Coordinates of C-alpha atoms in Angstrom, one line a residue:
Chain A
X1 CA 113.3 15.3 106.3
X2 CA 115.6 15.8 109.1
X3 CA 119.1 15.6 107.3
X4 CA 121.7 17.2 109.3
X5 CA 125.1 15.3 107.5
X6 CA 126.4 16.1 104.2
X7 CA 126.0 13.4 102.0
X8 CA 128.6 11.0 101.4
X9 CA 131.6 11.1 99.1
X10 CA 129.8 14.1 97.6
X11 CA 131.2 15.4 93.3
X12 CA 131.2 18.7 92.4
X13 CA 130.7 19.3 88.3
X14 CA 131.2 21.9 86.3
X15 CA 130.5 22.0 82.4
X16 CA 132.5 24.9 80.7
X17 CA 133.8 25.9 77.6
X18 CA 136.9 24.0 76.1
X19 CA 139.6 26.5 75.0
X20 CA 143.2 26.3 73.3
X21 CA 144.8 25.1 76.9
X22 CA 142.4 22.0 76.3
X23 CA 143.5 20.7 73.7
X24 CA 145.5 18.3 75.1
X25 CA 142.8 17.0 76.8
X26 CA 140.7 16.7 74.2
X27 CA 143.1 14.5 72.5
X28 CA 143.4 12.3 75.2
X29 CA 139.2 11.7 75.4
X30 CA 139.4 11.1 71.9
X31 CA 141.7 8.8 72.3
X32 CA 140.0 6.7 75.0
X33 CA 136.7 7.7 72.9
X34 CA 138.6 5.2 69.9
X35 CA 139.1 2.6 72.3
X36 CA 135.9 3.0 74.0
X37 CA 133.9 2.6 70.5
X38 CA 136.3 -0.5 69.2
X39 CA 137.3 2.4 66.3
X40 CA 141.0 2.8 67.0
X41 CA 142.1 2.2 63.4
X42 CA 140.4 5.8 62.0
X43 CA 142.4 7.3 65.3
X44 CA 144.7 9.7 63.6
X45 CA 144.0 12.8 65.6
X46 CA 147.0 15.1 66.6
X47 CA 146.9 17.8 69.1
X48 CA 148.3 20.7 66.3
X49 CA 145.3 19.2 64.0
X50 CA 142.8 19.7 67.0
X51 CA 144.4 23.3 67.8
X52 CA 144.7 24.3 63.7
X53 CA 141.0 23.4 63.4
X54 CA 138.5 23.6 66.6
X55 CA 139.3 28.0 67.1
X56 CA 139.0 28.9 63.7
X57 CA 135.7 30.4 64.4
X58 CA 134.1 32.2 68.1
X59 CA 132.2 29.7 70.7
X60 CA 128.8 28.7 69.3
X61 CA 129.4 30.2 65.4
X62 CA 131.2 26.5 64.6
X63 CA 132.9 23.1 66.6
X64 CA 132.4 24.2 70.0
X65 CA 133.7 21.7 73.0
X66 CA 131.9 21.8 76.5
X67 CA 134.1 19.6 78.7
X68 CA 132.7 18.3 82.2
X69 CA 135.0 18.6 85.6
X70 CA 134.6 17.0 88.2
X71 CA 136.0 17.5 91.9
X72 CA 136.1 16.1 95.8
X73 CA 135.6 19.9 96.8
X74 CA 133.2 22.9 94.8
X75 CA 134.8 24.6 92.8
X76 CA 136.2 28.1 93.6
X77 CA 134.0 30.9 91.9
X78 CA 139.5 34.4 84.1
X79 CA 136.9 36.2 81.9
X80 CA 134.6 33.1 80.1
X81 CA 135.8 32.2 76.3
X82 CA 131.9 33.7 75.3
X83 CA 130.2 36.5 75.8
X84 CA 127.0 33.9 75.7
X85 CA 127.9 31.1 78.4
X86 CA 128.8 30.7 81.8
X87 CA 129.8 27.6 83.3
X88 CA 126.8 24.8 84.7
X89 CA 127.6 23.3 88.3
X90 CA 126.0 20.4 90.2
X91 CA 126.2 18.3 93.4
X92 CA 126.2 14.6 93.1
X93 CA 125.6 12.0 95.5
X94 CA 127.7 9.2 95.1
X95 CA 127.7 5.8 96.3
X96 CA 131.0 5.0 96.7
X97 CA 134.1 7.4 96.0
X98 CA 135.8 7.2 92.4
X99 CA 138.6 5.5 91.6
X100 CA 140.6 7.4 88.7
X101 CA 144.1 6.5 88.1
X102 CA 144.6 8.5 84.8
X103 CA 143.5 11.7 86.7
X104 CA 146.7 13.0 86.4
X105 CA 146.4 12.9 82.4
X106 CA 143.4 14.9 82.8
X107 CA 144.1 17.5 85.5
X108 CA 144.9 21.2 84.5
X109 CA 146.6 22.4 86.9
X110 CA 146.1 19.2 89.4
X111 CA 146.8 22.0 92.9
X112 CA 142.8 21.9 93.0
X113 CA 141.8 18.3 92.7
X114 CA 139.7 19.2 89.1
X115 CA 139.8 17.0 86.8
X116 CA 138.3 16.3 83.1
X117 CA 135.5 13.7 82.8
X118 CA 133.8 13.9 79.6
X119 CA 133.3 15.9 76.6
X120 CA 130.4 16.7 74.0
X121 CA 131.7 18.5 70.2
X122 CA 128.7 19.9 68.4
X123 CA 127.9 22.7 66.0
X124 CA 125.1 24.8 64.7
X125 CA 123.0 22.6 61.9
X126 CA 120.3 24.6 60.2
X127 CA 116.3 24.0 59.5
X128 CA 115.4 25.3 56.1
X129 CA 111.7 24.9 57.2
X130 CA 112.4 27.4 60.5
X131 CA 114.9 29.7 58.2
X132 CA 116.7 28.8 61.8
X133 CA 120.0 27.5 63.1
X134 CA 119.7 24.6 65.8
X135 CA 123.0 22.1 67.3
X136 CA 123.9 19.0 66.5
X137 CA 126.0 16.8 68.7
X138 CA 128.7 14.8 67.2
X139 CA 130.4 13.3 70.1
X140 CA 129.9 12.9 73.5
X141 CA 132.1 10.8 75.8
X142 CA 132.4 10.2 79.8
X143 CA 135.4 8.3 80.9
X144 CA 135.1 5.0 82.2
X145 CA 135.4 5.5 86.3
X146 CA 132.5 8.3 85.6
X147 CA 130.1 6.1 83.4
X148 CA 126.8 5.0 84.6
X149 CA 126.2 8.2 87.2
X150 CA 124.2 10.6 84.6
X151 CA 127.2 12.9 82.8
X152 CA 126.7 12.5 79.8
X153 CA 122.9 13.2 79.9
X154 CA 123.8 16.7 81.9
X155 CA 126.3 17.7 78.5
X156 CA 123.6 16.8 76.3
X157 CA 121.3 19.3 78.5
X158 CA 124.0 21.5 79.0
X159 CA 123.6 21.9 74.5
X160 CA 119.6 21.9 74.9
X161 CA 120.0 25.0 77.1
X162 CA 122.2 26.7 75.2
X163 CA 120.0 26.4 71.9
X164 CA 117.0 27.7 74.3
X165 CA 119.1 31.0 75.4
X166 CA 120.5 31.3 71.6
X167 CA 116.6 30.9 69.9
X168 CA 118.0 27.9 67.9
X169 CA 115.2 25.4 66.6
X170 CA 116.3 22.0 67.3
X171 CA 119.1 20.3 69.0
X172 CA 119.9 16.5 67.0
X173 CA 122.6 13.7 67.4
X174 CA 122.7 9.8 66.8
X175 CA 122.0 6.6 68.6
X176 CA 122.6 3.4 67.7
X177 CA 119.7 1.4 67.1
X178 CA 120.2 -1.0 70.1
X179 CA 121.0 1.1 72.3
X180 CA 117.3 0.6 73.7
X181 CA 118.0 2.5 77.1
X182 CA 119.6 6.3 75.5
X183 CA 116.5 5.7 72.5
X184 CA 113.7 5.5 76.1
X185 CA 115.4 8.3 78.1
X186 CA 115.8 10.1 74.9
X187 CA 111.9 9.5 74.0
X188 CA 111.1 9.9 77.9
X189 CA 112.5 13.7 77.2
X190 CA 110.6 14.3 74.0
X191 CA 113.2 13.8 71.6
X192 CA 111.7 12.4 68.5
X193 CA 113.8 9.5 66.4
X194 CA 114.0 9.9 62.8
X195 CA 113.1 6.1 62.1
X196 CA 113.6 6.4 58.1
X197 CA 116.9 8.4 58.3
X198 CA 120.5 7.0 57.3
X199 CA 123.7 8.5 57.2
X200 CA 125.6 8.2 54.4
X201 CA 129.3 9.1 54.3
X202 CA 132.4 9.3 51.7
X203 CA 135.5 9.3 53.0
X204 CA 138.9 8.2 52.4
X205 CA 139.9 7.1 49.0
X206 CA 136.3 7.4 47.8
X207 CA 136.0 10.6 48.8
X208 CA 139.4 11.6 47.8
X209 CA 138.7 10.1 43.7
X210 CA 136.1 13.1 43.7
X211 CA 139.3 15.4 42.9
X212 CA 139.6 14.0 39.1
X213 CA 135.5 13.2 38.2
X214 CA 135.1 16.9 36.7
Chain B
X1 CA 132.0 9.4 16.0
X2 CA 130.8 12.0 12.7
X3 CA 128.6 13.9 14.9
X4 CA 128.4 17.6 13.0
X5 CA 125.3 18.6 14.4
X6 CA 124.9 20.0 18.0
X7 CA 122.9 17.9 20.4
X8 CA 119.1 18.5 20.3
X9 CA 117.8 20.7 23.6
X10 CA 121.1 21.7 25.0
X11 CA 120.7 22.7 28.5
X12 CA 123.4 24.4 30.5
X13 CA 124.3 24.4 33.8
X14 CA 125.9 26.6 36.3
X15 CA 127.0 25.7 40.3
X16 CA 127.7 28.7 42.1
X17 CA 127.7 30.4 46.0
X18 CA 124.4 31.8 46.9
X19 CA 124.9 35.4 48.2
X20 CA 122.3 37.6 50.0
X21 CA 120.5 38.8 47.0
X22 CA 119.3 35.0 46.0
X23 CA 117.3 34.8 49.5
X24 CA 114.3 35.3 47.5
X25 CA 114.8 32.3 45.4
X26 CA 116.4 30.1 48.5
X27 CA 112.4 31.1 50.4
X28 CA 110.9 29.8 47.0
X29 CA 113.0 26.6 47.1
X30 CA 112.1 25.7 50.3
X31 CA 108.7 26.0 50.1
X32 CA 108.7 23.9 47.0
X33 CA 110.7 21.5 48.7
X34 CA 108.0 21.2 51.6
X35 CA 105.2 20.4 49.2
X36 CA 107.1 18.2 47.8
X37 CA 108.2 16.3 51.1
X38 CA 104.5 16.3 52.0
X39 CA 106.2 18.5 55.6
X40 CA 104.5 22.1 54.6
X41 CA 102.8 22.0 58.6
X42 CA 106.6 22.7 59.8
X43 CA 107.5 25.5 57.1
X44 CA 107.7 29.2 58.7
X45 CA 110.4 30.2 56.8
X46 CA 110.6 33.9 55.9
X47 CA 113.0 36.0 53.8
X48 CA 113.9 38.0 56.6
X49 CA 114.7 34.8 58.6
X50 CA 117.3 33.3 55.8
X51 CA 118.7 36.7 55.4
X52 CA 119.7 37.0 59.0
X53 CA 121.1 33.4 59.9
X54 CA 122.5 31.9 56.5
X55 CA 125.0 34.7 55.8
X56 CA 126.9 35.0 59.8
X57 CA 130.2 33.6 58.7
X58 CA 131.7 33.6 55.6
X59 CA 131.3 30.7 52.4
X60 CA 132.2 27.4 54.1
X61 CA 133.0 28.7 57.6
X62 CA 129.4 27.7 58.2
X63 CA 125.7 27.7 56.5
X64 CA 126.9 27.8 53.0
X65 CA 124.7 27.0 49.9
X66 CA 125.2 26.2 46.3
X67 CA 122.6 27.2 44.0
X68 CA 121.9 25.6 40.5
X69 CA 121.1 27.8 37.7
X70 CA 119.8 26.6 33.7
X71 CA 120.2 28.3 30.6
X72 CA 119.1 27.1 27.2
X73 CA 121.9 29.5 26.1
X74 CA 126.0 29.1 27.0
X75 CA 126.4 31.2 30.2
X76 CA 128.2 34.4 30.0
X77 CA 131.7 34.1 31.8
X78 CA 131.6 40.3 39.6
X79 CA 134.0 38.7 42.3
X80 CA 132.6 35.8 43.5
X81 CA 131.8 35.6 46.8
X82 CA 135.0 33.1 48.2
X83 CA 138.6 32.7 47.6
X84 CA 138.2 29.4 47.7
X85 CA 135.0 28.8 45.2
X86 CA 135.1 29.4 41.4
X87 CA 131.4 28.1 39.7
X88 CA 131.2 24.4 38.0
X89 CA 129.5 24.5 34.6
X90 CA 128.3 21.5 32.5
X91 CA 126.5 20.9 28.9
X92 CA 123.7 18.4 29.3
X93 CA 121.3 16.7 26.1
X94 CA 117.7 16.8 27.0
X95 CA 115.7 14.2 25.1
X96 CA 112.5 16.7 25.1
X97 CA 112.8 20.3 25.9
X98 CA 111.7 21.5 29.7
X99 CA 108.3 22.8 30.5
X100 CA 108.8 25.8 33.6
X101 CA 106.1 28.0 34.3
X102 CA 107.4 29.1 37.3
X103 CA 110.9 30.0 35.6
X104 CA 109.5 34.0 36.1
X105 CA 109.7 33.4 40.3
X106 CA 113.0 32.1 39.8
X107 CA 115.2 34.0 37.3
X108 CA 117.7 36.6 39.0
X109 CA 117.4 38.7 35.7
X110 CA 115.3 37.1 33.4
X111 CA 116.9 39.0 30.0
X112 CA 119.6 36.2 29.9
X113 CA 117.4 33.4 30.4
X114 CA 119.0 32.0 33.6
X115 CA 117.0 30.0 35.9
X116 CA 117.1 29.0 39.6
X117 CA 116.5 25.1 39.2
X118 CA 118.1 24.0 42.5
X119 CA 120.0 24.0 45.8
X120 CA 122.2 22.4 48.3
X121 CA 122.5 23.7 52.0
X122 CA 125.7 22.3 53.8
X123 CA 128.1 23.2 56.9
X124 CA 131.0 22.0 58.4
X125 CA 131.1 19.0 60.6
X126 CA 134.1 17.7 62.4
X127 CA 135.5 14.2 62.7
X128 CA 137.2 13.9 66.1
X129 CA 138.8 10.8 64.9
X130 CA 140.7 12.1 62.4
X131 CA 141.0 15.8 64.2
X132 CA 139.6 17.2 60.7
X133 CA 136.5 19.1 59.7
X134 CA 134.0 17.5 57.3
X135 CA 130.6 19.2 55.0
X136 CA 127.3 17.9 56.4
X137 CA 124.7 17.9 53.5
X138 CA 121.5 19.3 55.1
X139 CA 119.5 19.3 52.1
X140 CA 119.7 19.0 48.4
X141 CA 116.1 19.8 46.0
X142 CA 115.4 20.0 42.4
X143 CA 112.5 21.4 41.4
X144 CA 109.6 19.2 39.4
X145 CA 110.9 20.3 35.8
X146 CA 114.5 19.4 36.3
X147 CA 114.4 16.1 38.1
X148 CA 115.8 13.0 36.5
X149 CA 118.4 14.3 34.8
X150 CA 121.2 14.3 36.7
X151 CA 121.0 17.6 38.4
X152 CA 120.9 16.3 42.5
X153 CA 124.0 14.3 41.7
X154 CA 126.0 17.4 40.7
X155 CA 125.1 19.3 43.6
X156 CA 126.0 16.6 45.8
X157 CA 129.3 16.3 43.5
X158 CA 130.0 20.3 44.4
X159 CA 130.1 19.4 47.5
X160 CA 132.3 16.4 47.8
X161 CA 134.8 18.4 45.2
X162 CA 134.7 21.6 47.9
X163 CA 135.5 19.0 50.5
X164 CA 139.2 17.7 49.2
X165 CA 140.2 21.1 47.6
X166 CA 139.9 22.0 51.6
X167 CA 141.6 18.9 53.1
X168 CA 138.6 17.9 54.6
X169 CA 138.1 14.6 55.7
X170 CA 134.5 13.5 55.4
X171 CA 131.3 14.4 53.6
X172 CA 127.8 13.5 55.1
X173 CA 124.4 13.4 54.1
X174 CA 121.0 11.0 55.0
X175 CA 119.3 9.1 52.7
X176 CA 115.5 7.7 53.4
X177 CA 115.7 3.8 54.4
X178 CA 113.4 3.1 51.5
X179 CA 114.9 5.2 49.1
X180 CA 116.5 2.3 47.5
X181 CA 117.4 4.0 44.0
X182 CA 119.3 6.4 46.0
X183 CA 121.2 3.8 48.2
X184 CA 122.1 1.9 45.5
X185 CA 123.9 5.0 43.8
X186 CA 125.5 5.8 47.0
X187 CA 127.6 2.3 47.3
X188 CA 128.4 2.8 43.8
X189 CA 130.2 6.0 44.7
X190 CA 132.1 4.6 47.5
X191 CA 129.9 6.2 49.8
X192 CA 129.4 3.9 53.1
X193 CA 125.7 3.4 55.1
X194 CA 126.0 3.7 58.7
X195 CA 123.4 1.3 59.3
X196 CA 123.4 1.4 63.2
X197 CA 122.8 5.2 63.3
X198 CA 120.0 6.2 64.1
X199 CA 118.9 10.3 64.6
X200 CA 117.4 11.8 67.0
X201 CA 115.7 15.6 67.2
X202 CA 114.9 17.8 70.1
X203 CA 112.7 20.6 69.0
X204 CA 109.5 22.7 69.8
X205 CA 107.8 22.7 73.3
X206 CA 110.5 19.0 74.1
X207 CA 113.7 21.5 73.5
X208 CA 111.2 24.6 75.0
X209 CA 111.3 22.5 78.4
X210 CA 114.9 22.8 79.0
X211 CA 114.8 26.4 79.7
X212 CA 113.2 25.3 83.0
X213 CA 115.5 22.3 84.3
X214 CA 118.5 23.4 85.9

């Protein structure tokens, strides 16, 4: 195909790990996360809470954040935060440029045009059938002006290749039931859906009354 | 009440922190536990296996598991394995005494009478919400001569009481859909049913793919 032009408005990405001098951004996609999933009520999260309890373990052992950035130019290529990663990059061919008027809420340092996108938290589960670890994905957000363009599906790839390199034996997360187009890409990949599996959750002052049954 | 006489068939129970040396007895466990769940084609489990993924991080920071032990005698009362763990005990009346023939594969010692009858496996999860971690309950099993009597319920309990001596803010589990003895002692608890939730699980040659896409 004889393609001389770049394409146009091209988006460079990059999926690295989060680290301490996220955290503010992180609180800021959970934030528009709350709003996002009409769940602003439980939003209670503080940046010293997300600080106090996201490090307490190395990347990959516990909560481990891969946040997406995203750029009008590629990004020029600090030692990484594991011995066991190194950043993803891809080129995207947009239709029309992005609008973004928070970017400045989500830019850090702002001198280089990179700005945060989109997030996924997860952390090793376990298979006591495989006596092996595996990931499971908790959250996974793409702001609005980035929706609809395939982020979120390269995060959740960016957690399937990590359990690849690490051996783990499976890589799980949730979808709501009528969300009919994540459950066809999701069975179009070979992800399997649990179909008689519930979650069940105590929390709050039911959880909390567990502190006098002895 | 005049009740001079001890109850007939006491049984005593002990909840404490599995270490390295009950690997043995976590294998045996989980094999009886895939019989049981009719899902014996998936278990490959091996001693060797447990031994080098459950015990990575220390009690709670990660894979953590509480194991149940019997007695037909009051248990004796080594440091324990966390800081933050001390065992729960509780005196239960049997109607009829319990039949084990397997009690030889699953008695650390044997010479005191104390029996491995069950096990919960459970790691942090993180509520991004509330910027707090959480305990996911990955699995909980009885085995055949102790179910019935209460035993699943206190191993779930360990782990909801582990949760707010921590500060945590959630505790999770799944229940089957048709499992409706189960549900129904879950709302009774205060526990909620995420009914839209729906999980989903990459493993095998589906997760084996994503080695090759870049």
């Amino acid at each position: 195909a004889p393609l001389i032009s770049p394409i146009g408005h091209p988006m460079f990405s990059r999926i690295r790990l989060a680290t301490p001098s996220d955290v503010p951004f992180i609180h800021k996609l959970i934030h528009q996360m709350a709003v996002f999933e009409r769940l602003t009520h439980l939003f209670s999260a503080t940046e010293s809470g997300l600080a106090s309890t996201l490090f307490t373990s190395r990347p990959f052992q516990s909560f481990t954040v891969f946040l997406l950035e995203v750029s009008r130019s590629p990004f020029p290529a600090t030692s990484s935060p594991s011995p066991d990663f190194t950043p993803f990059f891809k080129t995207h061919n947009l239709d029309l440029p992005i609008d973004d008027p928070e970017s400045y809420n989500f830019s850090p340092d702002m001198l280089n045009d990179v700005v945060v996108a989109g997030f996924v938290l997860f952390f090793p589960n376990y298979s006591s059938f495989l006596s092996k670890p595996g990931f499971y994905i908790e959250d996974i957000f793409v702001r609005e002006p980035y929706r609809r363009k395939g982020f979120g599906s390269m995060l959740l790839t960016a957690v399937a290749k990590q359990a690849v390199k690490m051996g783990y034996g499976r890589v799980e997360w949730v979808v709501l039931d009528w969300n009919v187009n994540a459950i066809k890409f999701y069975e179009q990949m070979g992800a399997q859906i649990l179909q008689e599996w519930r979650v069940c959750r105590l929390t709050g002052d039911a959880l909390e009354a567990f502190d006098q049954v002895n």
